[PDB]
Design an enzyme around this catalytic site. Sequence first.
Site, PDB file in Angstrom:
ATOM      1  N   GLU A  27      42.453  50.225  51.191  1.00  0.00           N
ATOM      2  CA  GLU A  27      43.825  49.929  50.706  1.00  0.00           C
ATOM      3  C   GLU A  27      44.887  50.021  51.774  1.00  0.00           C
ATOM      4  O   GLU A  27      45.683  50.956  51.793  1.00  0.00           O
ATOM      5  CB  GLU A  27      44.120  51.017  49.662  1.00  0.00           C
ATOM      6  CG  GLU A  27      43.201  50.871  48.432  1.00  0.00           C
ATOM      7  CD  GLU A  27      43.483  51.867  47.322  1.00  0.00           C
ATOM      8  OE1 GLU A  27      43.177  53.072  47.358  1.00  0.00           O
ATOM      9  OE2 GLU A  27      43.898  51.248  46.224  1.00  0.00           O
ATOM     10  N   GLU A  50      34.560  49.595  44.184  1.00  0.00           N
ATOM     11  CA  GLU A  50      34.909  50.646  43.230  1.00  0.00           C
ATOM     12  C   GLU A  50      34.907  50.069  41.863  1.00  0.00           C
ATOM     13  O   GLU A  50      35.532  49.005  41.709  1.00  0.00           O
ATOM     14  CB  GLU A  50      36.338  51.237  43.410  1.00  0.00           C
ATOM     15  CG  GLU A  50      36.408  51.937  44.769  1.00  0.00           C
ATOM     16  CD  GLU A  50      37.748  52.435  45.245  1.00  0.00           C
ATOM     17  OE1 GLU A  50      38.043  52.555  46.374  1.00  0.00           O
ATOM     18  OE2 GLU A  50      38.579  52.843  44.295  1.00  0.00           O
TER      19      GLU A  50
HETATM   20 MG   LIG Z   1      44.415  54.929  47.775  1.00  0.00          MG
END
Ligand SMILES: [Mg+2]
Lengths: 1011, 1011
Positions: free
Chosen positions: B449, B525
């Site tokens: 991210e 994820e």
């Molecule tokens: Mg994060």
Amino acid sequence: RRDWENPGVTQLNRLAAHPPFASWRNSEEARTDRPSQQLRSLNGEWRFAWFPAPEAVPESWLECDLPEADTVVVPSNWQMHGYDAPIYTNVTYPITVNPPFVPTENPTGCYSLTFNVDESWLQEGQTRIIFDGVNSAFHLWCNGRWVGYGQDSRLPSEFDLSAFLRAGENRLAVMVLRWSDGSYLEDQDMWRMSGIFRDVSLLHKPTTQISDFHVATRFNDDFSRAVLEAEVQMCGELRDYLRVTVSLWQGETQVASGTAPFGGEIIDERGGYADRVTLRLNVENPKLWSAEIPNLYRAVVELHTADGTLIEAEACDVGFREVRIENGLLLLNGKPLLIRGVNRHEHHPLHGQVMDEQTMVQDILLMKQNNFNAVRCSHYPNHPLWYTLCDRYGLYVVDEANIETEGMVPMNRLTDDPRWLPAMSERVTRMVQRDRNHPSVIIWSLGNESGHGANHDALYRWIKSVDPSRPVQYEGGGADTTATDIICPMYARVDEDQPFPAVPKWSIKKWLSLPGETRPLILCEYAHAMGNSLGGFAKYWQAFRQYPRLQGGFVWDWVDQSLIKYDENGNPWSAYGGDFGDTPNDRQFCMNGLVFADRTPHPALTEAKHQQQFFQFRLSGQTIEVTSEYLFRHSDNELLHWMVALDGKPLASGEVPLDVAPQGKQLIELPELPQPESAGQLWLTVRVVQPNATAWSEAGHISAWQQWRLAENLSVTLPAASHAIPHLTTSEMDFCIELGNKRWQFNRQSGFLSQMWIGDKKQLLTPLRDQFTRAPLDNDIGVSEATRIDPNAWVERWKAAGHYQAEAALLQCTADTLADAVLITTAHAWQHQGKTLFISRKTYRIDGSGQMAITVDVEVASDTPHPARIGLNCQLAQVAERVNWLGLGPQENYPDRLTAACFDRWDLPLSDMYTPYVFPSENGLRCGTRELNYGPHQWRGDFQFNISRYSQQQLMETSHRHLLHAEEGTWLNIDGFHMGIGGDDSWSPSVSAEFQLSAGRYHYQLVWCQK
Amino acid sequence: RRDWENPGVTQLNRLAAHPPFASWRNSEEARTDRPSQQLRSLNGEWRFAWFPAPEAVPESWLECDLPEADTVVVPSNWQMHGYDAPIYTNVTYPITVNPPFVPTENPTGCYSLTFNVDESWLQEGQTRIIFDGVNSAFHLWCNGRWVGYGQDSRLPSEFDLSAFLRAGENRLAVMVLRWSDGSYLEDQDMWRMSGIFRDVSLLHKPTTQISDFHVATRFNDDFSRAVLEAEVQMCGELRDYLRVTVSLWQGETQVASGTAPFGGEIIDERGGYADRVTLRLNVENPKLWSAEIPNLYRAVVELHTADGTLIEAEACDVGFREVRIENGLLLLNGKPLLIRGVNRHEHHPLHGQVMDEQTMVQDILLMKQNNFNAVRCSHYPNHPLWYTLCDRYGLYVVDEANIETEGMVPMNRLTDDPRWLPAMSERVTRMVQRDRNHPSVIIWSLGNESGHGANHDALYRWIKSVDPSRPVQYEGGGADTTATDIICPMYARVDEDQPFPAVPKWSIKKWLSLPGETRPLILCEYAHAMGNSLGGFAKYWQAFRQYPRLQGGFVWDWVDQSLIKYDENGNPWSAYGGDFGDTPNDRQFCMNGLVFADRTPHPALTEAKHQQQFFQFRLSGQTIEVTSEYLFRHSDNELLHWMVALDGKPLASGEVPLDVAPQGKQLIELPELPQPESAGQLWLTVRVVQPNATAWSEAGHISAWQQWRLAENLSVTLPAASHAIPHLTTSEMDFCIELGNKRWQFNRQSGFLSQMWIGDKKQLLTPLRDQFTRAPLDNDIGVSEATRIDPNAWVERWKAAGHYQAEAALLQCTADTLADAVLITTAHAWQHQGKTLFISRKTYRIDGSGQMAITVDVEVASDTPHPARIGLNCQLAQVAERVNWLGLGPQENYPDRLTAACFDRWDLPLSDMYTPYVFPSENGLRCGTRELNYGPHQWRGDFQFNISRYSQQQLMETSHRHLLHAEEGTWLNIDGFHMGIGGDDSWSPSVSAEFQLSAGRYHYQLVWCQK
Ligand SMILES: [Mg+2]
Ligand SMILES: [Mg+2]
Ligand SMILES: [Mg+2]
Ligand SMILES: [Mg+2]
Ligand code: NA
Ligand code: NA
Ligand code: NA
Ligand code: NA
Ligand code: NA
Ligand code: NA
Ligand code: NA
Ligand code: NA
């Protein structure tokens, strides 16, 4: 700290890189590119002091001027002020290779400057100092306070001085280190110098300011519409009332304009850039930019408030053009280029590496005048004005990162090392960030001769990723790695492969077609122009024209890197490697240009001009077919002049205006060509002339030419009953021939014509003797060194064979009387250590007309190396002012370098018959000569010749032209045959087989007579 | 110099990264991976002092111990010692975003150690210190002298102390900064701690040594032949007598061996690496490595002289396996992987971020025991031993760079900024250099991210270039950018698209086939296991199995990141975000694992276990078809146990050996099954048992199971007639029903069954009433908070509709008398502010047999949010020991999370019926229940129920499990219907529509009676 010995530290406190700024506070000035009151130059007189190491620098210097300092001009290279010696080393690092360390003995230049600053500058806004170029690393202090540090000698380093300056007088202190970890990435083949060699200035920007801007131009399928996209980034506080307006201008006319508040589109889950905005403007029928027609617009970017108050404006020239590789071809505006390029280092014989506009303009003009359409920035980013000029005069540019580590072993020792990735990446990213808005830049280069490492792959992708608009190239690791979009070898030959292991140089024609290969091929370096070179240049051009994927090259290189030295009389001379006490050094290897350091051309430049013509011609009948090689323009500034001459005598000519579309053809019928009364060869010559002056040429510039032989009429006319008969006087030692007030004497033991008299005047200083060697050219020498012979070089093969030490043995010398003439016959063998190298058989026929006819039959042992030449030579007693001949000229020309020369009647001062190459050698030859006139003498036949005041002997014995001295008389070398000069490269035999004198048996004939 | 606030300086004097070294001076030891005398641990007791900022540290400390210092264990995280608080923030940076600066109050830990060094270390060679993990940056001094600096909290920082030590006692001083510019690249979702949290060691190497080695294994088409290639690099003095021997062993057998002197092949124009050598060894029929069978070889690398003296030896475990993507699929040894992965952060409830071998082993064993075959190192390189274990136990690993910058706006702010390329570069390159010889690593990840920036593309390419053996993935910027070989979204749903701007999350099935897409898809994820979660887990598995390019995923995540705290009485309790006074914080978002911080499983783990089974079964007749999902091994430690049971009453079982080839089928015929004694549903259950113990399991381990309903004989048997008749008693306030020892009391004002007696014992503490709500799970709440309500969260929706505050209105209440029974009829409306939410209609029929039959028909306004549940509830007066039931179990199970559960008769201590989620909520439900027994009671029907000592009210008002208090009696929740729990993500509604209670009308029936 020792920052200069740590590649993890390339700078400290340095501001980010960005496109050229000026901070105009008036839009129209921005628009017109006029001077900005916010941009001040600090060039001029500074204080300088030299130290042998940084540790030797007094702390006092930070606070105040050292009394012993001198006052010098900045920019400058300290070597050019005589503080230390510049060094000419090509591959070998000038320092011990022990990265990242440097010698302790590290020449340190202490520069300083006292100057004033207006409070208005300080009262608000930001004041930054910009160093356009500092070689090689430096620390910066302002008013005794340390500011920062910078590396990369070829990109600007900027620091904010806002908090360090005071209203009034201020003192800047700059410590420049000659060596640093940066040097390891600066192993370019040039003089190794140092200092603050490019501009120094101050720039005032507002606190809320434009901090970066990118301009992009995307097109529709036929280029009839474009979208100008301009991305703008700001720094300072954001406010809803802020705005950005980008406007586009075609001269005085406002083409388009758009405005918007800050705040870009959503980029990811966290949003978009609140501090950027992209303006998009539509442009209908844009005037496209090319090197053929450099149409430009002006983009003005204004940061202002909503009420209309300007905060500041930045701007740039915009060229609408698209660069892309498609289906294996490099296209510009949809058309495949043919790069007529040259590599060009930034060099001034007097200022060293300091560049000025005059100089830059002069280079460009000469380039254009010589049909060059592109330049490669070998091997680092250039002074910023350079790109502005290419933009405007129109040249395709390859912008190259300042990365060269050729001296490492292996070559990619550093480039494959991740610990060097950061330093390298700054050399690439900061270039792109500064130069990306220039339309003249069409290809990015990752550097030069740095092997191929993983760092190059990473950087290659970074670029493609930030600027998809331009291809990326790199020659390291074999010329065709995964880090290159273009196969860009250096010195790959046309037909001949050079299969080095791991990084072979295939013939360019073969390279293109290797299994799976599809990319375009453009030589990043070719036709090494060192000394009398450029032999076989045409061979390249013929291949480039024939193969679509062979798209040109950059010749190595533009100008000789000679520096000026002064003798005891204060007379200047051209110095090269080693001439400053620099050692080790690479001697003359720094002189490979098409022009001399002072911009005078070498003769090779004309060969380049001709091969690079933009018009091709073909003759058929009375029909001339001209074909335009331009991709975008019509021949709207050209007329074709033609002329027919018989053996130099002009019979007819005329002119026709050219009207050819890019890529088109035009047929021109010549008029009825009356016959001609006289034997001889008619020759047709055409030239393209530009009636009008352009920004780079004067009215009357000849941009191209061609010749063809037309009808020939052989003389079948029997001479005439000689008025008298030559008399032969035979003595023990000589055969003597008398005719009128002329006498010839042939020594019976030497077997040579030892003397000739006109009246009671001897005409010769040395007998007329066969000659088989030449004062070696740079190409003949290659890398061979006395201390380290390259037995493969030509020169070495000839020495060893005894060619230069060979002695004539007389095998026969007879004299006979014919009805109307006297005939002498000779035979001589040339041997060395018992081997017969050559055998020369001659006849001399002196007739009642007083003409002496010489016939030469020569044999050359098959196992001896092919000789440099096959002729005769002598030292004439006489020295005349002019040389007149009917042959190829007017300039020097050789077998493999004679396409540009024209067959005509030329006449020049004797001096123009000598080419002053810095490194003297055989020079000044003219081939294809049927008639030669000097003083009262005349020679006729079909031969090549050179004539000057220097013997081959002196030339081969002299290393610098300034040491040559006019000998008594004139040396005349007349060749039945001469070896080509080569130049594919200058470190290996490069003379093509078809240019070697390997026939084994050679015949030539000449008539010497009086005129 | 403030190195910690400059991303340009990420280290000073640090040594190059490299694979794990031990410098053995004995080959046999290196071979068996025995400890080395040359590699010493500095772990244990150190001196530590805490400061609030680097400026507060005294200079005295460099030279001597601070008296005030404490003695602490190293490694540790200082927050863990109470010196300061650990902070739990998810996305938002724990410090003001103002890169590269950090706060002036910057917690500083001053560590020191006095330790001994033997002269032998110092007489020769090099002594370096190795810090495996320092969070976030640090300066290092030795014997008072400054040595260097380091950043990147997750990789070893190594320094040469050779010039700094003396024989005997020595003193190190380490100043560790909590915050630094490196912190900007460390925004992972987890507690923010600091210290010397990984091992410290001392390594002695000879001066001429092995500086690096890469091992590669390449194969022929069918994997029957391999070549092991080991490239070895040295540092120190090269001599002709040096040699490298590389030997390969399989256990105690030498497979192959090879020797050569240094000097690698020609790389380029400058030659080759004189300091490297590549040994190539042939391996016939290698034993392939996989997670199914982790066959390893040992490679031993010896540096020595040709006379045979050993200089040093290094080595590593080698797993022969190829990783490649082809035709859209990720293949391992040629076969397509099915990733049963999990994300796993390094977390210990007590030690914080300190990892030990016991903990690691424990994790691995559980993972293996629960059918996981892969792990993602979210989001940084792990402690070195992790890899070694994964190698040996067999788990596929995704190694990921310690780069996460989520809190930037926009997310790629730093990653697209070239000034940050360097810092990022070291995080990626140093990981690869350290972990590249581990077979367990099959994919590299560029981080987590941090959007998608150009830095990513560059690094992506770097890795491809340096280690072609493994694919590179990265989810940032949209999960399918050009910086990833694998589409690796996070939380993309199965069938449902989430078309967010710029970075939509498409249904994964749809994602694969987007125009132009061809890559494999593996979720980085998925299935956010926060609290009572994993609802819809089977939907991913079904998709994974059906679609070839859907190759699995990594569940988020392994263990809750709860920390232990002690109460006033020293009683420990699980803490989460905000529990340390940390603010701001992310509260319970730090608990998302399949297991509690202590490794006890949460119930969802079993769900994952079942879905991830390696055997698939089908039933046709008496025939079971077992299919293997192994790619490599035969079912050689497996037998099948089958059982048939009638209403939980066993009828028959057996066992059959499994003999299935990878990807093969086995048909097993069950035996004639005798006919059953009576009415009921026969159920078949099969289980895969491993009779023999493994390195990761006990003999007896069940690795897979499945059930099927067989024949059902419905009951047509009319029961014997009550030898009695219930008596009703109408009072103004109540209707009473009496039957022998039993009595039912129905309140006429409430319309509810308010009391029950057996003998003189009252049965209830609270009346029996309808219930339409549940104590909200993490997923029902999502990101909603008191201070920042999230109106789209189911919890808000219910609250806003008045579901939790709805009051029952009695519409009807009547008592009727039949021949055999008593019939009570009621009807209630639940309303909120005039809105009628729900209508409940029921009948209670009490008959002669003492059974109380209840019939419920519920109406739900089409326009109210779908209720969480539909059932009844009451607080029983009894508290019994066991809970027995015939339904799904034995673990907690919900509608969208019940596939792993099995239908049978279960009996557990009442306490096992409560699930101790740290954040309390509705929990403990068991579905498909036909009979439930507790205390004297029995309930029969078809429902879902939970039973415990906590009311819903209480669960819904308590934040931490540790504060719950058992209530009087036992809370019973019996539902006809219940909403799914969802779990695709925990921040948006994620309960699929088929699991929402939207039918509008519901009916259910229960019989209550005396056990
Ligand atoms: Mg994060
Ligand atoms: Mg440095
Ligand atoms: Mg070079
Ligand atoms: Mg730093
Ligand atoms: Na071409
Ligand atoms: Na050169
Ligand atoms: Na014209
Ligand atoms: Na010479
Ligand atoms: Na699949
Ligand atoms: Na989390
Ligand atoms: Na078996
Ligand atoms: Na709660």
